[PDB]
DNA sequence: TTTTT
DNA sequence: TTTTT
């Protein structure tokens, strides 16, 4: 049984944008940026939709946030798969905001080639507990490191519906291989931050649970 | 409006009790303890009694957890404020669980003095966001350090009730002086780690909300 | 963030 | 962990 949280402090990239479903249902979807001062001294940029849903999207949509302003973002993974119109299953995992605050100082915005800026020294951790889905098999990089993919379903629960998020977590080098052994159906928690290539959990620490 | 969370991964120092109240409520009460790897190399150790609640209580007595297992918790600061039956009012900041799951590997357990055990190589961290409680001002400590005790308050709601946590952080060198300007009433957010001396919010992040 | 000792 | 596009 599951557990799924992202927290990330960075700006937003632009402007958000407030949408309806065929259902009514209100969408609230912002591009947050930041770089991350990873201490070994890396900066990992990372840029990530983040959507709230309903009565929520609207209070959120009221505070008229604009292209750079800093928030701090409590949220989930949030996994889902659809058809395309071309035809054939698709699947992505985005973040799910569950509270969204403002910033009270300007940070540095960094900016981007495309036109986007990003939030200078900025925050972005997960953490998220699930079943292995598939036996890993340890790869190598070109430069030779070693790389394990992980891939786990977080059981979520919410009249009482089970959905499942299929969330793929990159382990490298030494834990790459202290975690060589995981098995199909291991329990296994995760926490690391969340990167672009595809949504991904960069794991920092992986922990094998009992049973 | 408040967040509250802490994430543990540690030791039972030693075994678990299980006891009800007055009303019949189950509380299932552990001292999780272990030692952190602060990464500049500190190890900062710590104790935590930790109670769950309720009927997920008595599934976890069910458990049969002893001695030195290894547990990950995921849970909240919970402030309490009673009578003594000396006389006089006590208060104190424990940590309520939410979910508490056994690691699948055997920790290394650090023997201490008084006959408990606490796990290397731990985990520790708390975010929180509230309101300072009061203006706070800046100290020395013997050997020079500013140091700045930052006092929150943590809005929580859940026939719909109020509660508020009062919670203690203290912030060292440039963070107590980066946040020398905080005002009765702002909004915060800090993150960190959980210590004992009264149980304290270490704080390694703290941003000032907009409002 | 359901809740106390 | 309420929910989709
Ligand atoms: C504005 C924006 C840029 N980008 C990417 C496209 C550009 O190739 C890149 C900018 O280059 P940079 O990362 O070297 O500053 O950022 C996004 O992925 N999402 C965005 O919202
Ligand atoms: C077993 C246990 C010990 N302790 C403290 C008391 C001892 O003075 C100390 C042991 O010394 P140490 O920290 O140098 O190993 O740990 C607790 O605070 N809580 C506990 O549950």
């Given at each position: 049984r599951g557990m799924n949280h992202v927290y990330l402090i960075g700006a937003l990239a632009r402007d958000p944008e407030l949408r309806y479903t065929g259902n009514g249902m209100a969408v609230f979807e912002a591009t947050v940026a930041g770089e991350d001062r990873?201490?070994?001294?890396?900066?990992?940029?990372?840029?990530?939709?983040?959507?709230?849903?309903?009565?929520?999207?609207?209070?959120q949509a009221e505070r008229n946030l604009k292209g750079?302003?800093?928030?701090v973002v409590e949220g989930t993974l949030e996994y889902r798969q659809w058809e395309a119109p071309e035809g054939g299953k698709r699947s992505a995992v985005n973040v799910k905001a569950l509270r969204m605050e403002q910033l009270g100082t300007q940070?540095?915005?960094?900016?981007?080639?495309g036109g986007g800026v990003r939030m200078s020294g900025a925050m972005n951790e997960v953490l998220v507990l699930g079943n292995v889905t598939r036996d890993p098999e340890i790869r190598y990089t070109p430069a030779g490191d070693a790389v394990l993919?992980?891939?786990?379903?977080?059981?979520?629960?919410?009249?009482?519906?089970?959905?499942?998020?299929?969330?793929?977590?990159?382990?490298?080098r030494d834990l790459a291989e202290n975690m060589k052994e995981l098995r199909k159906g291991d329990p296994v928690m995760i926490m690391?931050?969340?990167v672009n290539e595809s949504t991904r959990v960069e794991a920092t620490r992986v922990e094998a649970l009992a049973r």
């Open positions: 990873v201490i070994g001294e890396r900066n990992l940029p990372w840029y990530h939709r983040v959507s709230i849903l309903g009565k929520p999207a609207e209070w750079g302003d800093a928030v940070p540095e915005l960094i900016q981007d080639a993919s992980l891939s786990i379903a977080v059981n979520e629960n919410y009249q009482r519906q089970e959905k499942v998020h299929y969330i793929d977590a990159t382990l490298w690391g931050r969340l």
